[PDB]
């Protein structure tokens, strides 16, 4: 590796005429790229109606009937059909634009439940009725606290006195004075700002409470074929909201950080276990405890959710590393 | 911090990731930083200054002559609109610049000018964890710092656009393609290993390691410690995840562990000789049948 | 992994065109992580048969602080002597 | 992986290694390969020839915001500094056009 | 002469003369690219004559 | 006051940005690291703007250091900056050690008498108080008569 | 787009984005795609 | 009285906002959107463009000061903060000094682009290289730097300290 | 406006402006100030004319 | 873009196109040039709005 | 190595999970691929296609775009106001009293202003307001 | 008016549609280590030659001193110069010049000294003196590189640092007629 | 939210006896401006939702944020510079109290007053560290607390 | 050379021209445009006139700094001991700048 010597034998001014000879290497032929790639390119369909300024002769239209029909999910997606209220509002959404729905290479998923699916109900797997009462209490407390600390106190503190709070003058080194609301913001931009802020804050608080409470599972019932589990969770108005989940969607898996297993909620005997419906990337937080679950079907639900939590999550031992993966047999057939 | 391209990149992120993964010249020319470009030689008749353009008929270019040490510019800034097809000589400089029309392919011609483009920077790629370091002493010096780690186990493969759609809508096709790609990667790795072995046999080692005996002993000890720590961590993880890994005999193992620890932590103190701890003893008690083999 | 950039481009068997033969590009072959200079002074001189790359390394930079303490004694003693003389004079 | 001696001999007789492999994957190990994830990337035609992405050609929202800012500024300045409000009744044709629009 | 017609003349000749004259020069220097047509020689000369004289006259 | 009003307007802007980010995140269902970092940066900027009332505190040390004339001008001829730093470090170490493992001055005091701290001038006070403190002394005496 | 059908309705959910007199929404005002 | 003064103050505020917007839009491109070869060697760019960039930086300098002065004047006019009343602490000299700190740099930035325009016009007409491009660029930059120190020149009769007057005259 | 917008794309050799939306906003916004600063000489809070007998109204 | 050539090297107006470099019997008289057709300058292009209206139209 | 045990559902497309090692699934459906594992990305493709087209620049929320009535009203009002402002400021500055109306509001603590009259209905009524403190 | 067209609505084949065989991959890897790879571009000049041809001799057919006599006699009148020289003399002045070229040179309208200088320049640099100077290429030249190929160089027009002032054209004309709204349409 | 906002607007209008026509005009103009800004931001978000997030785009967004912060901080810097060297009457006779009018506010309450912003910053940092390992529904509580 | 090899951006901020020897024929891994403004706007470079004028102005400014403001910031309140002396010293430190008085030496010229 004497680099100078390498240079002394690498770039010689004599071989200049042959030095920059870009040569297509005569390497081994690869049928995938040297045979299959050309012929497939050679079979490219052609059209005579390319856009004069923007089209291309090989830009052929793909038939929608030739697009891959949806078989990924056995449940409908009403977001494709939208909501009548939106129609009644004539709202312009990105999930209802027909051009956006006109996928060129694939066929869009069906917006209605698949005809194979039966909507009949079966038997309840788990139930927790007092959760509704607890959630209602929490939501009512949140609403009452927001109203009190935000409106009732501000209403009196701003419109029912002339002396400001001690927090108003602790930082200002100015002579004391009284405050009145009849000589402030003559061009009342503060009124619309306060109204908009209050409306948006109330909406955000409601939506956040609904999202927080919407992950837990309040009532569950596996279907007659146990394919579509009907579950009622907590609704935003404190009521119940019913949905369905496909059997293949739910699972229980080790966390992404294997060191966090000991700090998992399900590690406790009276904890919580999350079934993750992978189809909608949804979560159903069942109470990890024996009292709430139904004895008859639990094992099957346990057998239907425990698929990735295997020995591989811990690794392979010294005697097991020999069988880590499937052996690749190459060259024994030529 | 590195984006999951299989679910995110559609057109622009697709081009950027493809450039960062394959270094295709046009692709590189797609994302070359405007701050600086690789400096080439002066344009001669035999050695034209190769100015690349991604399949564009014309490109504006300025002529500065032969730059000197004293002055960064040699000649007056004369701008010309070089067109693809033939070399053009800036008259004031006599500078022969040749336009190159880059076409999206994998031909050896693309390999000819592979060294004419500076490699793309990976610092700005991916998501960032800090808006901007508001340090006036580091305003234009260091790139943004990140709090998360960047995985390096990724192996990227290009896909035909419509075919990619078929992967996005058909999970079974995605699984089959992933298995086939893993098999292909394994085959390629085995072939590379065989090639390296053959090259070593036909040529020999490049040399001996210029390392110290103390460092060599420390490295051997470090390897042994790494193996031991890996075994210990594996045992700890196996014990911790006992409930979820196995569910049928979990009740029996838990009951046996509780009974054994009851007569070990109550009514009797446990004098532990060696590195065996209470957690290790409980783990050994739980999967008692497991440790009986290996 | 290369030290002299020329050698890096000497005979590259991992060209992207070659990489096109299998369509499998691991992140471990990123160009930005391929090669880097040695940060030492390097001058290309006209050798007897071809150019030779001479390597100038001015100062080794692995000094232990003890050595720094080893050399500082004479200067400190001279400073002390000068201060004492200027005080006495 | 596993490789057969017959295929190895056939390849060696057909191809003799005359150069080393520059791919960094040559330095990879079997466990490291087993700890790898395959990724997919759609390849299609390229249209935006810049480091930055392609941008639209119209901002009617921006134009309208600028016009509204100008109108609001004019009205507020007239009503505050000059204490004057526009008597919109004189331009009957303009008012009719605005109403019809 | 603070705050007087001398200062007024200084300010005007520095701004109205030099800056506007340079603006007109750049307009004529880039008349084609901005307008797409060649300038009108006679009327342009008349403008350059009357504008230059008026500044000094005022 | 003008600075405080500007700070209030900036705080309003930052709150509006945070609210918009929250609404968009709720609409989307997945968080963006750029958005999170931008919100964190806005909050940091607001927090930096929060400590603005300390102008008198900042003025003290700077005006004290600004009053010194040149040492070579021979007004005081004393330049003991680093000397003060080192000696004060040692003295503060000694003072902390004394406050830790020595006799601590007592803080218990009377807390239930009316105007017990309102002390008037007397022979025990030398009557060298403020020249106009006679009114305060008389009021204190009258209040003591009331509370007696 | 008055008397000249430049836009196509099948690709537009809300026809009428520009002032025109030769277009009508495929989704009628009393239409409602139901499940 | 209420009227033209307030209207002018509001117009000045609006102009300052617009100038800030324009300056951001211009300077952001020059720092980021420069071509591959025009990253740092400003001598390559035309004289008019160089003057444009320099005047944009100069405007970005004085615009916040002008805006703050306008805000203070508006507060005095409409809230009576005595920001200019000699009775309880204020001084018209402060307002005059602020206006002059916005004053002379404004004229200096205004007259700058015309020189670049003339320099660009002359070189093409004569088919010759400029006399001293680097020297002219450095002189323009030095004149811009010096314009920030001629504030007292336009207020010589305000009666500042004789040292300040002498310094202002020497800088002018 | 004119010189910068015309030349920076050409002279600086940059694609459009750094913030084209901001450039358009400023171009459309200048008219408000232009009009406001030019109406002060003819419009005053004292609207009535010298011969206007404002006492009657 | 325009691609019509409209001007090339034209002689035989004041300089004869024949080769009389060393023709002592031939004398060139530039003052006796024959009349030619006046070539008006290229008038500015007029937009074919309709086609342009189609070219700049947006779907 | 742990191989998938069995599948119990009805749709045979689910049987594809029976030929993959759990880690592989964890590799292709969890950690990095958790947000996309075992989900048909119809929504992703739809969103990308929608974003690709040159749609109306006016938007209200991430879910739905801006209201057509609001857009039309804002555009018409802006155009009419700009036209009126231009006409008045460039042509109708002669008799401002003929072309302008005087009105303003005073602070509620302060007494009602003399010019604080209802616009366009002055010839019918007179207004006054009680102060507060 | 053509209807809307979506380039992403048509399938494209920029990559093979099938995966390669394991044995084929092994063979390709074996071959890839057996043959040398094509070199990448190296910007090192091999053997530079005088770009404007050989430098003028101290004495000979056309010494540099004669060139030194040209700059002082440079002029640009409003008409062509009928001072046409005898082509043979020009041919005598520049050994290797084509006679017809001199006839073309003598028809240019320059004074005989300038004509001889232009003829010498064309003979030394191989300039094609018959190509018209237009907006696309200001001049055309033919050369023979170190690879021996007979290549053509189109010396194009330039600008005085003002691209806006540069007449960007695609025709062999002199007028500036085209006004492209986008300076960089392809960004 | 709509009920509360409408009730607040009506109560404020009734309290101020606002003129309906002028109030409606001002409110419409403000709504137009705000809606336009929000629509621009939403349009940018929707465009950057997919196939638009380049490293150039990220850098441009960071640069835009930094420029906005710098432009905002400029006026406050001028105000602080004016306030530090604030004007007053002559200290010789006119304004003698300025020597004793330090107006130094005690820091003993500043920390207690400012603690909420620090708590919010700490919660933001925790959320930024937690986003890589948490779920969208799991992190909603942090967002709610930050909003409150 | 080590700095330029390590952090090229800093080298650009330092205006250090590319020190890598590109005689090998292969282009460098990281090229950049130099910003020699710091190396130009100096008294020993093309900015000699600008730097000289700036230095002269700063010397004029430094004289104003050392003799007009800082002494004014020294004494602020009425003093019991030699207040008149301190005020006289402060004022004479500023009221006797030669630029205000040196004319009379050569007065017949004017
Ligand atoms: Cu001035
Ligand atoms: Mg004056
Ligand atoms: Zn040149
Ligand atoms: Zn740095």
Automatic annotation (TrEMBL), chain F:
Domain of life per record: Eukaryota
TM annotation in the entry: 1-23, 35-58
Protein name: Ymf68
TrEMBL record, chain G:
Organism domain of life: Eukaryota
Name of this protein: Uncharacterized protein
Automatic annotation (TrEMBL), chain J:
Superkingdom: Eukaryota
Protein name listed in UniProt: Uncharacterized protein
Species name: Tetrahymena thermophila (strain SB210)
Residues shown, of full length: 60 to 118 of 236
From TrEMBL, chain K:
Protein name, as recorded: Transmembrane protein, putative
Organism: Tetrahymena thermophila (strain SB210)
Modified residues (N-formylmethionine): 1
Transmembrane recorded as keyword: yes
UniProt superkingdom: Eukaryota
Keyword list, A-Z: Membrane, Transmembrane, Transmembrane helix
Stretches that traverse the bilayer: 70-91
């Amino acid at each position: 590796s004497d680099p100078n010597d390498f240079y002394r034998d690498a770039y010689r001014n004599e071989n200049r005429w042959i030095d920059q000879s870009v040569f297509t290497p005569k390497t081994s032929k690869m049928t995938h790229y040297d045979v299959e790639w050309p012929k497939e390119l050679a079979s490219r369909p052609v059209t005579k109606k390319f856009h004069h300024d923007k089209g291309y002769k090989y830009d052929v239209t793909t038939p929608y009937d030739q697009r891959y029909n949806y078989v990924a999910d056995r449940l409908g997606h009403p977001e494709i059909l939208g909501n009548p209220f939106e129609r009644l509002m004539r709202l312009e959404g990105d999930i209802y634009h027909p051009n956006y729905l006109d996928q060129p290479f694939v066929k869009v998923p069906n917006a209605n439940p698949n005809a194979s699916l039966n909507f009949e109900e079966g038997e309840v797997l788990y139930e927790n009725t007092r959760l509704l009462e607890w959630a209602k209490f929490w939501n009512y407390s949140v609403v009452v606290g927001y109203l009190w600390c935000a409106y009732f106190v501000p209403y009196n503190i701003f419109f029912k006195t002339h002396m400001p709070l001690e927090h108003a003058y602790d930082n200002l080194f100015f002579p004391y004075f009284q405050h009145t609301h009849f000589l402030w913001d003559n061009n009342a931009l503060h009124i619309p700002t306060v109204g908009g802020v209050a409306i948006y804050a109330t909406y955000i608080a409601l939506s956040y409470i609904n999202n927080i409470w919407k992950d837990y599972v309040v009532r569950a019932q596996f279907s007659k074929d146990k394919e579509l589990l009907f579950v009622t969770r907590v609704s935003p108005f404190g009521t119940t909201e019913e949905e369905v989940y496909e059997v293949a969607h739910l699972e229980h898996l080790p966390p992404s950080v294997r060191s966090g297993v000991k700090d998992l909620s399900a590690q406790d005997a009276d904890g919580l276990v999350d079934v993750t419906c992978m189809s909608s990337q949804r979560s159903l937080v069942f109470y990890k405890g024996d009292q709430y679950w139904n004895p008859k079907v639990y094992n099957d639900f346990i057998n239907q959710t425990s698929n990735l939590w295997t020995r591989n999550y811990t690794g392979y031992n010294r005697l097991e590393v020999q069988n880590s993966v499937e052996q690749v047999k190459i060259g024994f057939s030529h | 911090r590195m984006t999951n391209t299989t679910e995110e990149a559609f057109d622009e992120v697709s081009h950027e990731w493809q450039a960062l993964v394959t270094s295709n010249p046009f692709d590189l020319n797609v994302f070359n930083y405007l701050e600086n470009t690789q400096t080439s030689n002066f344009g001669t008749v035999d050695n034209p200054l190769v100015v690349f353009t991604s399949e564009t008929p014309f490109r504006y270019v300025g002529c500065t002559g032969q730059m000197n040490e004293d002055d960064y510019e040699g000649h007056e800034l004369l701008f010309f609109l070089l067109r693809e097809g033939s070399l053009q000589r800036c008259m004031g400089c006599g500078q022969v610049f040749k336009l190159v029309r880059l076409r999206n392919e994998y031909s050896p011609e693309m390999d000819y000018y592979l060294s004419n483009f500076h490699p793309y920077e990976m610092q700005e790629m991916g998501e960032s964890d800090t808006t901007v370091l508001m340090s006036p002493y580091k305003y234009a010096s260091h790139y943004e710092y990140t709090q998360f780690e960047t995985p390096s186990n990724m192996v990227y493969s290009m896909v035909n656009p419509d075919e990619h759609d078929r992967l996005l809508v058909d999970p079974a096709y995605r699984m089959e393609r992933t298995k086939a790609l893993e098999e292909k990667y394994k085959v390629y790795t085995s072939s590379l290993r065989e090639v390296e072995k053959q090259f070593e046999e036909r040529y020999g080692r490049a040399g001996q390691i210029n390392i110290s005996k103390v460092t060599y002993s420390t490295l051997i000890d470090v390897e042994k410690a790494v193996l031991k720590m890996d075994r210990l961590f594996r045992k700890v993880a196996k014990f911790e995840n006992r409930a979820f890994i196995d569910r049928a005999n979990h009740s029996r193992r838990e009951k046996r562990m509780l009974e054994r620890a009851q007569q070990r932590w109550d009514s009797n103190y446990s004098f532990f000789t060696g590195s065996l701890t209470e957690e290790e003893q409980k783990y050994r008690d739980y999967y008692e049948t497991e440790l009986e083999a290996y | 992994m290369f030290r002299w950039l020329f050698l890096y481009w000497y005979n590259s068997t991992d060209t992207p065109s070659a990489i096109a033969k299998v369509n499998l590009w691991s992140y471990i072959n990123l160009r930005l992580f391929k090669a880097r200079l040695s940060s030492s002074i390097a001058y290309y001189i006209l050798g007897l048969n071809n150019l030779e790359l001479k390597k100038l390394k001015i100062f080794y930079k692995n000094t232990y602080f003890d050595y720094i303490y080893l050399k500082s004694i004479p200067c400190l003693f001279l400073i002390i002597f000068f201060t004492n003389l200027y005080l006495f004079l | 992986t596993v490789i057969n001696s017959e295929f190895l001999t056939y390849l060696k007789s057909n191809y003799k290694i005359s150069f080393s492999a520059s791919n960094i994957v040559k330095y990879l190990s079997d466990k490291s390969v087993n700890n790898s994830v395959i990724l997919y990337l759609r390849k299609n035609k390229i249209f935006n020839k810049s480091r930055y992405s392609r941008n639209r050609q119209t901002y009617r929202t921006g134009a309208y915001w600028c016009l509204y800012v100008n109108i609001i500024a004019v009205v507020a300045f007239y009503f505050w500094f000059y204490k004057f409000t526009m008597n919109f009744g004189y331009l009957w044709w303009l008012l009719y056009s605005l109403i019809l629009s | 002469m603070h705050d007087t017609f001398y200062v007024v003349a200084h300010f005007h000749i520095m701004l109205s003369g030099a800056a506007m004259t340079g603006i007109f020069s750049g307009i004529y220097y880039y008349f084609n690219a901005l307008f797409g047509v060649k300038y009108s020689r006679m009327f342009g000369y008349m403008h350059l004559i009357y504008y230059s004289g008026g500044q000094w006259v005022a | 006051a003008i600075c405080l009003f500007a700070k209030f307007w900036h705080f309003v802007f930052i709150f509006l940005f945070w609210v918009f980010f929250v609404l968009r995140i709720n609409e989307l269902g997945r968080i963006r690291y750029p958005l999170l970092v931008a919100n964190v940066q806005n909050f940091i900027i607001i927090y930096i703007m929060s400590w603005a009332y300390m102008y008198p505190w900042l003025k003290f040390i700077f005006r004290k250091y600004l009053d010194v004339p040149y040492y070579w001008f021979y007004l005081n001829g004393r330049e003991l900056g680093i000397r003060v730093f080192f000696t004060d470090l040692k003295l503060f170490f000694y003072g902390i050690t004394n406050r830790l493992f020595d006799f601590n001055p007592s803080s218990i005091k009377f807390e239930k008498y009316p105007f017990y701290y309102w002390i008037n001038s007397s022979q025990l006070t030398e009557f060298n108080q403020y020249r106009k403190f006679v009114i305060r002394d008389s009021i204190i005496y009258s209040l003591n008569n009331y509370i007696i | 787009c008055i008397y000249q059908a430049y836009q196509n309705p099948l690709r537009h959910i809300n026809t009428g984005h520009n002032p025109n007199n030769v277009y009508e929404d495929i989704v009628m005002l009393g239409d409602y795609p139901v499940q | 009285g209420v009227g033209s003064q307030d209207i002018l103050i509001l117009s000045v505020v609006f102009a300052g906002i617009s100038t800030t917007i324009s300056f951001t839009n211009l300077l952001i491109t020059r720092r980021t959107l420069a071509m591959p070869g025009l990253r740092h060697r400003r001598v390559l760019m035309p004289f008019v463009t160089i003057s444009i960039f320099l005047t944009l930086r100069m405007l970005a300098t004085i615009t916040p000061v002008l805006g703050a002065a306008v805000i203070m004047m508006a507060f005095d006019r409409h809230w009576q903060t005595t920001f200019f009343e000699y009775a309880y602490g204020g001084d018209p000299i402060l307002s005059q000094h602020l206006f002059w700190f916005f004053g002379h740099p404004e004229v200096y930035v205004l007259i700058i682009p015309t020189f670049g325009f003339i320099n660009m016009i002359v070189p093409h007409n004569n088919t010759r290289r400029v006399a001293s491009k680097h020297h002219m660029i450095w002189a323009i930059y030095v004149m811009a730097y010096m314009g920030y120190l001629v504030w007292g020149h336009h207020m010589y009769l305000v009666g500042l300290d004789h040292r300040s007057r002498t310094m202002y005259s020497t800088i002018t | 406006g004119g010189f910068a917008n015309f030349l920076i794309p050409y002279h600086v050799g940059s694609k459009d402006v750094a913030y084209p939306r901001l450039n358009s906003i400023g171009f459309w916004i200048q008219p408000c100030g232009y009009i406001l600063l030019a109406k002060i000489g003819f419009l005053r809070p004292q609207f009535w004319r010298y011969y206007d007998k404002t006492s009657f109204s | 873009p325009y691609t019509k050539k409209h001007d090339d090297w034209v002689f035989d107006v004041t300089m004869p196109s024949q080769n009389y470099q060393t023709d002592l019997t031939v004398n060139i008289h530039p003052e006796n040039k024959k009349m030619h057709v006046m070539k008006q300058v290229m008038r500015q292009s007029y937009w074919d709005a309709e086609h342009d209206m189609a070219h700049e139209y947006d779907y | 190595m742990n191989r998938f045990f069995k599948v119990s559902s009805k749709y045979q497309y689910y049987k594809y999970l029976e030929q993959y090692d759990a880690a592989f699934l964890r590799k292709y459906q969890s950690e990095t691929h958790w947000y996309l594992g075992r989900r048909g990305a119809w929504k992703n493709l739809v969103i990308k296609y929608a974003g690709d087209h040159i749609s109306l620049e006016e938007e209200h929320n991430v879910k739905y775009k801006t209201h057509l009535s609001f857009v039309y009203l804002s555009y018409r009002l802006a155009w009419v106001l700009f036209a009126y402002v231009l006409i008045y400021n460039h042509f109708l500055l002669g008799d401002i009293g003929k072309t302008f109306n005087v009105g303003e509001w005073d602070h509620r603590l302060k007494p009602s202003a003399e010019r604080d009259y209802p616009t366009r209905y002055e010839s019918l009524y007179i207004l006054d307001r009680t102060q507060k403190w | 008016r053509a209807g809307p067209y979506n380039p992403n609505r048509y399938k494209d084949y920029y990559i093979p549609r099938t995966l390669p065989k394991n044995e084929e991959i092994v063979e390709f890897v074996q071959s890839q280590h057996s043959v040398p790879a094509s070199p990448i571009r190296n910007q090192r000049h091999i053997n530079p030659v005088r770009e404007s041809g050989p430098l003028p001799s101290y004495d000979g057919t056309y010494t540099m001193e004669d060139i030194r006599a040209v700059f002082y006699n440079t002029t640009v009148g409003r008409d062509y110069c009928y001072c046409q020289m005898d082509p043979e003399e020009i041919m005598r002045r520049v050994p290797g010049i084509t006679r017809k070229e001199a006839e073309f040179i003598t028809k240019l309208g320059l004074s005989p000294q300038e004509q001889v200088d232009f003829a010498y320049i064309a003979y030394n640099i191989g300039l094609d003196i018959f190509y018209f100077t237009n907006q696309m290429f200001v001049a055309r030249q033919v050369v023979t590189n170190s690879k021996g190929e007979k290549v053509e160089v189109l010396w194009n027009a330039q600008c005085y640092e003002d691209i806006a002032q540069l007449n960007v054209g695609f025709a062999p004309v002199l007028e500036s007629v085209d006004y492209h709204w986008e300076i960089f349409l392809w960004a | 939210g709509l009920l509360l906002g409408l009730s607040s607007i009506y109560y404020l209008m009734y309290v101020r006896l606002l003129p309906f026509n002028k109030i409606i005009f001002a409110w419409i103009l403000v709504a137009m401006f705000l809606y336009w800004l929000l629509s621009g931001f939403v349009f940018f978000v929707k465009k950057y939702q997919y196939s638009k997030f380049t490293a150039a785009i990220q850098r441009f967004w960071k640069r835009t944020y930094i420029i906005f912060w710098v432009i905002e901080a400029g006026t406050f810097s001028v105000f602080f510079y004016l306030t530090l060297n604030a004007s007053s009457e002559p200290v010789y006779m006119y304004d003698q109290i300025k020597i004793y009018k330090t107006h130094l506010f005690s820091w003993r309450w500043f920390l207690i007053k400012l603690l909420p912003s620090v708590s919010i910053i700490l919660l933001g940092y925790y959320l930024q560290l937690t986003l890589k390992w948490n779920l969208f529904n799991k992190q909603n509580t942090i967002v709610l607390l930050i909003t409150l | 050379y080590e700095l330029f090899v390590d952090h090229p951006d800093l080298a650009q901020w330092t205006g250090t021209y590319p020190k890598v020897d590109s005689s090998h024929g292969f282009p460098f891994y990281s090229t950049y445009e130099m910003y020699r403004d710091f190396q130009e706007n100096t008294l020993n470079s093309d900015g000699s006139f600008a730097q000289w004028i700036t230095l002269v102005c700063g010397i004029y400014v430094i004289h104003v700094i050392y003799n007009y403001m800082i002494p004014y910031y020294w004494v602020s309140t009425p003093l019991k001991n030699d207040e008149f002396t301190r005020l006289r010293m402060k004022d004479y430190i500023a009221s006797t700048v030669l630029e205000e008085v040196y004319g009379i030496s050569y007065a017949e010229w004017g």
